[PDB]
Amino acid sequence: HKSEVAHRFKDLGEENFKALVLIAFAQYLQQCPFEDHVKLVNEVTEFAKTCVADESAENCDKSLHTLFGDKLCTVATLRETYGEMADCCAKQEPERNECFLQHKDDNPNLPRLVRPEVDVMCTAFHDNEETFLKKYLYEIARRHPYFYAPELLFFAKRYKAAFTECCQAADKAACLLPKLDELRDEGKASSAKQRLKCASLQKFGERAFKAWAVARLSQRFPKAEFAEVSKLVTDLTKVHTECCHGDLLECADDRADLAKYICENQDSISSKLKECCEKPLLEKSHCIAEVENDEMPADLPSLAADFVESKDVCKNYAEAKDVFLGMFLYEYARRHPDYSVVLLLRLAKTYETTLEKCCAAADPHECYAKVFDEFKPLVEEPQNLIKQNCELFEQLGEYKFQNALLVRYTKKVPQVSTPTLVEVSRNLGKVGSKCCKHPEAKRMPCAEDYLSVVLNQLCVLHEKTPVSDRVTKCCTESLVNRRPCFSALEVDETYVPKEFNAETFTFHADICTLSEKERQIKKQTALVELVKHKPKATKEQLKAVMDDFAAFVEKCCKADDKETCFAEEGKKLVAASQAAL
């Protein structure tokens, strides 16, 4: 293209162009104030307008990396605010762009964004929809300089949807805050999810990533030929490789190219893409990333003929080990959208170990002709765990199910800080709430999707402050054994009971005057501490004081006097509890 900026401006449109320019600059100049970014956007935007009017116009033939880097090196305060980053301006492309890339600062030190009151928010939204919305877009991008820009744009449009609706409703806050809590959860999860793929790719290498992609792409497009899945796995591996490196434009072009290939070859891939493929370039690769699985072809054969009977197993394996294993993964995954990806990786690795053991032995076929028996226990384990836990979740509430998780995980690893124990148990409990309302045909992918983002981010929090050798051993091992390792943790019988502290189990009337959530957290915080102080307490014994405490609060949080019921009756509850434990 004669002018890449004019071309982008025509592909995306003025509104999307401006928003992505803002995110781009907010992710590099993370301490410049919001109003100078607006100046940069308006300046880049009306320059781009000269380029769509005339592509021979001055500077319109420069590359976007050049144009972007040029804009960065005109910030007058660049060396005084970003210091060493300003020295990038003395290099030339592509060294300069790489130098700027290196100087992206993850985890900068900005105050946390405090959600204001609903009436404050709706009033700001009404008084200046754009400035309000773009300011929050800027606040989030500067605090997440590696969050892929278009997805951030796609979250911004969903926030706009939440405000327009709820700022008009009768009970504003009742409409808005759940939507805002929901959006925060996904954006935080997506941020965690991107950094996990990009950190297992280097921890574990291209091969393991390719193995994961074959499984995932085969469940999604089970009518595609394995040659087509392998083509897609290759392009997709390059795409995540390049996107992990951090160049937003080089990353965006790889994604857009892959989506153009997929949309051009739908009838070799899937019948579900005609709408996504009709969508504009900015949304094309996103839409297809989250499209639902295509229907499996009717009455596929068993995997027996190709992978256990056929005399050419060991010979076809040796001819190309990974391609043969990759074919096995393809055939198993396409038949099993109900499995998690990691389970399919367990099976494939299981098939790999026995093929490696039997293809070197006398009469291989005898040695390995039963390996499909080895798959059954590996399949029951995730399913069993889902059943019992989804069963328990509908026996108890969401909140009481959290309290069940709370007791169990505290007993397994009582060294974890109380607040971290509460947050994980509350979150896991949320995962029963959404995943357990799926049928068994789609429960295991649901759990995997959510556990993975609860598991390694408790592991990144654990590498921050290690407290147990067993949770580092879980967290530093394969992503296929991550969830089993944690499931295999047993009640810590090394632990020394925490010394009784009276202030930890003293309660006041403020507890009546707190929100349901904030009341549950403090109820759940005391429960962790109770299990830490008397860890040999049984759930029968624990239920008895939990019932007592429940009655205690409902008594003192309703009497004529309150501040004194909580100390007088409170003193009784404690003493009666210590006696029973």
Ligand X SMILES: Oc1ccc(Cl)c2cccnc12
Ligand Y SMILES: CCCCCCCCCCCCCCCC(=O)O
Q: Binding residues for ligand X, per CB under 6 A?
A: 140, 144, 155, 184, 187-188, 191
Is there a binding annotation on residue 65? yes
Nearest approach, Cβ of residue 116 and Cl ion (Å): 7
Site string for Cl ion, 122-141 (x = CB under 5 A): ----------x--xx--xx-
Pair of tokens at residue 222: 């089970």
Pair of tokens at residue 296: 């499996």
191 binds, among ligand Y, ligand X, Cl ion, none (CB under 5 to 8 A by kind): ligand X
Is there a binding annotation on residue 1? yes
CA distance 110 to 118: 23
Q: Is 303 helix (H, G, I), strand (E, B) or coil?
A: coil
- Cβ proximity to ligand X, 96 vs 144, nearer residue: 144
Is there a binding annotation on residue 15? no
The reply to whether 47 sits near Cl ion by the rule CB under 5 A is: no
CA distance 292 to 340: 15
Nearest approach, Cβ of residue 187 and ligand X (Å): 2
Nearest approach, Cβ of residue 71 and Cl ion (Å): 23
Examine residue 419 and say whether the peptide bond preceding it is cis (omega within 30 degrees of 0). Answer: no
Is there a binding annotation on residue 35? no
φ, ψ of residue 370 in degrees (nearest 5) = -130, 20
132 binds, among Cl ion, ligand Y, ligand X, none (CB under 5 to 8 A by kind): Cl ion
Smallest CA-to-CA distance from 519 within 399, 430, 420, 418 is with 399
- Cβ proximity to Cl ion, 136 vs 154, nearer residue: 136
Nearest approach, Cβ of residue 180 and Cl ion (Å): 6
- Cβ proximity to ligand X, 184 vs 536, nearer residue: 184
- Cβ proximity to ligand X, 449 vs 492, nearer residue: 449
CA distance 139 to 122: 18
Nearest approach, Cβ of residue 116 and ligand Y (Å): 30
Percentages helix, strand, coil for the chain (3-state, rounded to 5) are 75, 0, 25
- Cβ proximity to ligand Y, 20 vs 180, nearer residue: 20
Nearest approach, Cβ of residue 199 and ligand X (Å): 17
Instruction: Report how far apart, in Å, the C-alpha atoms of 306 and of each of 127, 213, 314, 333, 533 are.
Output: 66, 22, 11, 15, 58
- Cβ proximity to ligand Y, 20 vs 167, nearer residue: 20
Q: Which of residues 90-119 bind Cl ion (CB under 5 A)?
A: 115
Cα 406 to chain center, whole Å?
A: 22
115 binds, among Cl ion, ligand X, ligand Y, none (CB under 5 to 8 A by kind): Cl ion
How many CA atoms does the CB half-sphere of 20 hold within 13 Å?
20
CB atoms within 10 A of CB 466: 11
Pair of tokens at residue 360: 């070197």
179-199 burial by CB neighbour count: b if 16+ within 10 A, else e? Answer: bbeebeeebebbbebbbbebe
- Cβ proximity to ligand Y, 148 vs 163, nearer residue: 148
Smallest CA-to-CA distance from 52 within 95, 97, 4 is with 4
Instruction: Report how far apart, in Å, the C-alpha atoms of 392 and of each of 388, 399, 444, 559 are.
Output: 6, 12, 16, 35
Nearest approach, Cβ of residue 559 and ligand Y (Å): 18
557 binds, among ligand X, ligand Y, Cl ion, none (CB under 5 to 8 A by kind): none
The label of the residue with tokens 């800027």 reads 138
Q: Specify whether the CB–CB gap between 284 and 263 falls below 8 A.
A: yes
Nearest approach, Cβ of residue 189 and ligand X (Å): 9
Instruction: Report how far apart, in Å, the C-alpha atoms of 283 and of each of 9, 143, 184, 417 are.
Output: 15, 23, 21, 42
Select the residue whose beta carbon is closest to ligand X and give its number. Answer: 187
- Cβ proximity to ligand X, 149 vs 273, nearer residue: 149
**Member of 39, 158, 188, 207 binding Cl ion (CB under 5 A):** 188
Smallest CA-to-CA distance from 468 within 403, 529, 421 is with 421
413 binds, among ligand Y, Cl ion, ligand X, none (CB under 5 to 8 A by kind): ligand Y
447 binds, among ligand X, Cl ion, ligand Y, none (CB under 5 to 8 A by kind): ligand Y
Q: Specify whether the CB–CB gap between 65 and 97 falls below 8 A.
A: yes
Task: Give every CB contact of residue 403 below 8 A, 6+ residues apart in sequence.
Answer: 396, 425, 524, 527, 546
Is there a binding annotation on residue 245? yes
155 binds, among ligand X, Cl ion, ligand Y, none (CB under 5 to 8 A by kind): ligand X
- Cβ proximity to ligand X, 144 vs 335, nearer residue: 144
Nearest approach, Cβ of residue 437 and ligand X (Å): 25
The label of the residue with tokens 């765990």 reads 385
- Cβ proximity to ligand X, 188 vs 539, nearer residue: 188
- Cβ proximity to ligand Y, 364 vs 382, nearer residue: 382
Nearest approach, Cβ of residue 215 and ligand Y (Å): 8
403 binds, among ligand X, Cl ion, ligand Y, none (CB under 5 to 8 A by kind): ligand Y
User: Which range, of 88-96, 186-194, 366-374, 400-408, touches Cl ion by CB under 5 A?
Assistant: 186-194
Degrees to nearest 5, angle at CA 8 with 273 and 40: 130
322 binds, among Cl ion, ligand Y, ligand X, none (CB under 5 to 8 A by kind): ligand Y
Q: Provide the total of helices (H) and of strands (E) in the chain, helices listed first.
A: 28, 0
Is there a binding annotation on residue 11? yes
Nearest approach, Cβ of residue 157 and ligand Y (Å): 14
Contacts with Cl ion by CB under 5 A lie at: 115, 132, 135-136, 139-140, 143, 188
Binding residues for (4Z,15Z)-bilirubin IXalpha: 238
